[PDB]
Amino acid sequence: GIHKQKEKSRLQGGVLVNEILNHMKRATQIPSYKKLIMY
């Protein structure tokens, strides 16, 4: 249950993560996840 969901905070990593991820995380272009639900 908890395993599935992880903490996007408090976690650490090698700068590499900063260089490789440096770009962005997930689809920041978040348009509308639920709002859509209702058409």
Tokens of 1: 């249950």
Give the whole-angstrom CA distance, residue 20 versus residue 14.
Answer: 10
* Domain span including residue 39: 12-39
* 2 assigned to some structural domain: no
Method used to determine the 3D structure: NMR
**Residue at 17 is within a domain:** yes
Q: Where are the alpha helices (DSSP H) in the chain?
A: 15-21
Q: Name the DSSP letter for residue 29.
A: T
Residue 1, in any domain of the structure: no
Q: Is residue 29 part of a domain?
A: yes
* Residue 27 host element (H or E): none
Cα within 13 Å of Cα(21), Cβ side? 10
What's the N-to-C CA distance of the chain in angstroms? 32
Q: Is residue 39 part of a domain?
A: yes
DSSP 1-39: -TTTS--SSS----HHHHHHHTS-SS-TT---SSGGG--
Task: Read off the tokens for 24.
Answer: 């962005």
Produce one character per residue of 1-39: b if its CB has 16 or more CB atoms within 10 Å, e if not: eeeeeeeeeeeeeeeeeeeeeeeeeeeeeeeeeeeeeee
Q: Per the domain annotation, does 26 fall within a domain?
A: yes
Number of domains in the chain: 1
